[model samples]
Target: MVNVTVAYQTSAEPAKVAQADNTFAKESGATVDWRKFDSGASIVRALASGDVQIGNLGSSPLAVAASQQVPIEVFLLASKLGNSEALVVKKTISKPEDLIGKRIAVPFISTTHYSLLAALKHWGIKPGQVEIVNLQPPAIIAAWQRGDIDGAYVWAPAVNALEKDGKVLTDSEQVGQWGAPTLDVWVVRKDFAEKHPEVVKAFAKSAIDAQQPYIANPDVWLKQPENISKLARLSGVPEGDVPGLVKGNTYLTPQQQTAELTGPVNKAIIDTAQFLKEQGKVPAVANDYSQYVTSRFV
Candidate 1:
């Protein structure tokens, strides 16, 4: 069995990778040692420490990692474009301008946190104008319920749960429409990827391969034990909600990353960098998108 270390962030979507790995291990005779991480920052830290060989995460932390020179290459996207994240507020607020002087909860060093910071900058709001609290999704939801936060930027399960009682101030899909790609990526360590090109290729192919049954006959895919459990466990949304969410999101093949990173998606990353720089979150604009991306494995 080939040994592999897979790292994951806390978002519900990462569970799909776990499902895929479980599928791959069952069929390919590979031994994957998995690590569940609390945030993308932790996953990237593990990557820099050489503790993990592959990472399924969002782009914000990856950008931070790149800014600090993490030796990793993002070669795939766990999913294509989707409403993987949403900006939520108590059902009363209506516009971005209304967020002024409000407390916002987000996971520190996460894509959601970075995205929220960037979004606020676009609205001409200074970081100091709003109270930014670093918290996980669960805490964010709890805080929202207890009236501790006026707004929260978080991904699934929490978004799904809160939306039942609140409203989405914004979502990534809408952000994409507003000219921000907000895409998440799957990255692998440079050395690990270089040493096991075939393995990486096979791994990516297998994931895409799993989709065959998912697309050919929807009923068959939904009925799978692994997928069903994941649908219920990770997102905290019911198993029934999985189908709708899947249709809403795009799960791209490895080849798609090449076009994505080099096309409109590249422009989006550049825009995000500029916004971050303006917010004083990062020094200088690092949108030399080419340096930050690669299609070698794709």
Candidate 2:
């Protein structure tokens, strides 16, 4: 057993993953250092600086970072890219096109920000068509409550939170119709993956181990008032509504990643790189960026 460090975002899913890290390390006589990050940019920066071996990243940032030639390898499709990421609009805006001339709020560095921009571009809306405010999700939720923002591309529990007041304008799950590629991934530095294959394997196993308790008994965890309060505060959802919020999304399955690592999935990665390049988010001539993804450890 060796001392290992891993970083993840400050979210329920990542908290579950962190719980497993300590659980597995304790049983195996290994020590794991886990850190929580505020955004995908910070998590990727940690990976690039060799401060952490593995971390969760949004699909948009992973694509951009990889295209920028970050020495990292995406190991798994951590979560299915879908409705979990959404654009919540005020009662006034009814359709995606209505975002025209309206302010859509999201943190500048978040994946939701990238998804919103990509969604807008796919719909033939230029950056100037809609105002992208630098507000974080909570502020966006507040703005929505006050009818201040026209729309927002946000993630859970903000998705559910805002929709309680407004409506879903467009979610990433629904954006495939609009030609936007959005996803979230679990990645590690190339050197880290190669050097600690065993740790990677253990980490994957830990993910599986944690999900068992999470999905099976989420209510028990979700009902603890302190945990509920903390989650609600961090996510800005009401404390009583935390159970529904936490239990809605499905965790990733190991076999799914193993299966998607080949064939058309590889092509999708290539297409995403090309798409990002065309959007000016990455270099146009990047050919091998697609090959950097793998699920061999899974």
Give per-candidate clash totals: 1, 1
**Alpha-carbon lDDT of model 1:** 0.69
Best by TM-score: 1
- Tens digits of lDDT, candidate 2, 35-93: 76656877767887888878888766676677667888777665555666778887878
lDDT of 1 by residue, 185-212 (tens): 7778888877777767666666566555
What TM-score does candidate 1 reach? Answer: 0.83
| TM-scores of all candidate predictions against the true structure | 0.83, 0.78
Clashing pairs in 1: 80-250
**Whole-model lDDT, candidate 2?**
0.68
